[PDB]
Write a protein that binds this ligand. Structure first.
Ligand SMILES: OC[C@H]1O[C@@H](O[C@H]2[C@H](O)[C@@H](O)[C@H](O)O[C@@H]2CO)[C@H](O)[C@@H](O)[C@@H]1O
Ligand SMILES: [Ca+2]
Length: 769
């Protein structure tokens, strides 16, 4: 490996061998069907709301999130980079697809598949990833840096449906070597969204954009239809000329054939036919190819950028609504703009690399933080793009001021912005894209007094329940299978209108968003204030026994949606106390004296009673009325955690909080698989895991990272990082269970999982507060 020195990969990048088999992978631990796409994954490409494409560490374009809200795992084998090399003085060169695998059927059988093991590495530090190719049969060593321009405090380039592939080639040998790099792409119009005739009308064209000191050559893969539908638009691939390279292309090869129409050209001398052909296809799949060829002298390096764009302007949801995607603000809505997007990337990628470096540098340069922590911190952000992210720029046929936004809970539980989960998972948005965060919270504010008296069948028990109660915050803002933003509470497994945590978490999120954006946005507090007061006032009515605290009802009525709480719980009770304190402070800011006094009165009574009911001398009891009320809950002081972040001070005595956190570390972490897998949710005082429910026996990744941040703020630095380390290890390490780029909600002691690709572990960003 002599190519690594010619590029700059951070030491904190996650690494794996190209073609590496992983032996220890986990699988779902639930009885019913659950997504398991395997460990062959990688960092995604594509902006927020753009649809994303997961290119895996083996080189394949395999995890397709282009249909917004859906996860489709299938390798489109025509989509590849390939290499040709010939040493000066040899009769023949060698050609190789850079993919550690082969197609399942006979399509593309002429191509040289099965990139060998132990011949290259994949690296990832989201939004960047890299491949290096160090192969005994390839005298010139190659590397690529691939990324999309995901940039904090930037709402423009961050939306773009584009990826850059910056290639570096170096000749460490004593002979001249001819080299070619070829990007192939299938015309994927009709891959989704088209009910019949899936390839019909697809056609490919070549664009040559020549100006002074700029030559771009690109293929635009589209359809003859000018119809404005979810399925129609364009893909583009292309390259920018640099000194010392020549460009060749092939506009049309058949992907539903043996591929030799292309490969006989590339494998001879690495130079394509430059054959244009705009003939539309009928049944055959078609694709395009863009190649560069160059001679490297001994010791010579060359850099060449390729790009990929996709202009699919319309997203459709299962309920029928069609919306324009955010990037259409910048490029247009007609779906004929893929070249413009590609050109912007090829002309500006060096600026974008610097912008990414600028935001990563403050963390990467901090030598007090271990590299493993940086691996997790950056790579967990994959989910912001990969979480079915929807970001609208108008309803088709509709202009408003704002652009509504949603991130999925996950794909198994297909709900937008699940509030009990975003309480943990929304940290990156408030910290790095706060204008999105505030928009999402205003979306929630607008739902507070919505009433839908129509009744739905509750999945868990078969009871009938009212859809949406006035004054209760919704569980979610809809499902991609139905109508995001329009039809809230798509979740029907239980009735969220009786949950005891949603209204408090809502208030805490509002005050968080004010505090973490500088305590300057009084307009945001003004917009949300009525909903905050309504939310707390409705929750107060659920206090049955008049201790000042809402009562959990002994049926799941909070985020731990099978682990029943009854009476006053540490979890909902502490969240309530913190929400009351937050509302007091908002009252002071907005000069609402009567609100300040009322919430101060409620707070003093509830605080007193919480302490009396739950403090046992070592920790806070799980609740007052359950069978295992003395269980040690990892999340017992969630309200105090948020109070620390919101700078609301002590809601509980410092000594008692410190004792509780120490107990949690000693028990839920260190007595669970030697503290190497995170914090188990529930532990009995005798040091054995609480078996009352499956959720008590699970580690929740997002709960554990949040707990780590709580410990960190309280000065328990070693405990904080040790606690988080088990989550990193299970996710990313060779000794873990292979969950990179699909961090799950939970695992059990055997390491098997529930709900891969989950929003909650974005809570790791709470460690950067
Ligand atoms: O993991 C807790 C999380 O569960 C979500 O509900 C799931 C539930 O975990 C699963 O057992 C059931 O089969 O499906 C539902 C989704 O319909 C829930 O959406 C979250 O609020 C909760 O935090
Ligand atoms: Ca009560």
């Amino acid at each position: 490996d002599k190519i690594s020195h010619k590029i700059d990969i951070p030491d904190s990048a996650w690494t794996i061998g190209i073609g590496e088999k992983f032996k220890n992978a986990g699988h779902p631990n639930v009885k019913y069907p659950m997504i398991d796409d395997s460990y062959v994954q990688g960092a995604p490409l594509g902006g927020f709301g753009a649809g994303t494409i997961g290119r895996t560490y083996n080189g394949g374009f395999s995890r397709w999130h282009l249909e917004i809200g859906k996860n489709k795992y299938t390798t489109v084998y025509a989509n590849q980079f390939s290499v040709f090399q010939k040493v000066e003085g040899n009769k023949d060169g060698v050609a190789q697809v850079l993919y550690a695998g082969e197609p399942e059927n006979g399509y593309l059988s002429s191509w040289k598949w099965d990139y060998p093991k132990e011949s290259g590495m994949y690296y990832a530090l989201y939004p960047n990833s890299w491949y290096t190719y160090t192969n005994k049969d390839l005298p010139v060593q190659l590397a690529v840096k691939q990324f999309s321009p995901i940039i904090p405090y930037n709402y423009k380039e961050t939306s773009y449906p584009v990826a850059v592939f910056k290639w570096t080639a170096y000749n460490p040998t004593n002979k001249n070597v001819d080299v070619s790099i070829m990007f192939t792409w299938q015309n994927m119009i009709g891959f989704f969204g088209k009910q019949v005739n899936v390839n019909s009308g697809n056609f490919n064209k070549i664009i040559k954009d020549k100006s002074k000191d700029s030559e771009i050559v690109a293929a635009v893969m589209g359809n003859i239809s000018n119809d404005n539908e979810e399925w129609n638009g364009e893909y583009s691939i292309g390259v920018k000329k640099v000194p010392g390279v020549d460009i060749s292309y092939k506009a049309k090869f058949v992907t539903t054939g043996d591929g030799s129409d292309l490969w006989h050209e590339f494998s001879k001398n690495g130079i394509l036919d430059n054959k244009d052909d705009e003939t539309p296809t009928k049944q055959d799949g078609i694709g395009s190819a863009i190649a560069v060829n160059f001679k490297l002298q001994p010791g010579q390096t060359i850099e060449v950028p390729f790009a990929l764009s996709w202009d699919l302007p319309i997203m459709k949801f299962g309920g029928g609504d069609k919306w324009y995607k955010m990037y259409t603000k910048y490029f247009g809505k007609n779906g004929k703009n893929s070249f413009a997007i590609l050109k912007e990337a090829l002309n500006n990628y060096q600026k974008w690399e610097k912008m990414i470096d600028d935001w990563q540098k403050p963390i990467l340069s901090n030598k007090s933080k271990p590299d493993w922590y940086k691996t997790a911190l950056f790579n967990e952000l994959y989910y912001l793009a990969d979480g079915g992210t929807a970001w609208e720029n108008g309803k088709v046929g509709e202009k408003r001021t704002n652009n509504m936004f949603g991130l999925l809970e996950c794909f198994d539980y297909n709900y937008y912005e699940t509030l009990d989960v975003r309480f943990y998972g929304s940290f990156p948005l408030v910290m790095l894209w706060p204008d999105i965060e505030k928009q999402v919270m205003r979306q929630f504010a607008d739902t507070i007094n919505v009433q839908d008296s129509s009744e739905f069948k509750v999945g868990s028990n078969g009871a009938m329940a009212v859809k949406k109660v006035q004054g209760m915050i919704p569980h979610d803002l809809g499902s991609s299978y139905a109508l995001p933003w329009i039809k809230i509470n798509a979740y029907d497994w239980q009735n969220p209108n009786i949950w005891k945590d949603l209204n408090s978490k809502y208030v805490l999120l509002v005050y968080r968003d004010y505090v973490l954006t500088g305590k300057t946005d009084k307009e945001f507090l003004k917009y949300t204030w009525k909903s905050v007061k309504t939310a707390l006032d409705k929750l107060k009515e659920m206090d049955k026994d008049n201790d000042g605290i809402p009562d959990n009802e002994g049926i799941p009525d909070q985020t731990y949606n099978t682990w029943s709480m009854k009476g006053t719980s540490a979890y909902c009770g502490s969240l309530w106390l913190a929400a009351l304190k937050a509302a007091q402070e908002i009252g002071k800011v907005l000069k609402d004296n009567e609100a300040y006094i009322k919430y101060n009165e409620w707070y003093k009574i509830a605080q007193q009673n919480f302490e009396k009911e739950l403090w046992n001398g070592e920790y806070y009891n799980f609740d007052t009325e359950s069978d295992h009320k003395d269980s040690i809950m990892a999340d017992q002081l969630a309200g105090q955690w948020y109070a620390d972040i919101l700078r609301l001070g002590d809601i509980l005595p410092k000594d008692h909080v410190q004792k509780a956190l120490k107990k949690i570390y000693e028990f839920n972490v260190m007595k669970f698989e030697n503290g190497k897998m995170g914090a188990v949710n529930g532990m009995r005082p005798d040091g054995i895991v609480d078996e009352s429910d499956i959720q008590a026996q699970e580690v929740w990744t997002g709960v554990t990272y949040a707990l780590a941040s709580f410990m960190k703020y309280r000065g328990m630095t070693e405990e904080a990082y040790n606690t988080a380390y088990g989550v990193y290890k299970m996710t990313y390490d060779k000794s873990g269970k292979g969950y990179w780029f699909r961090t799950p909600e939970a695992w059990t002691k055997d390491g098997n999982y529930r709900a891969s690709m989950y929003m909650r572990p974005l809570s790791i960003w709470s460690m950067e507060v």
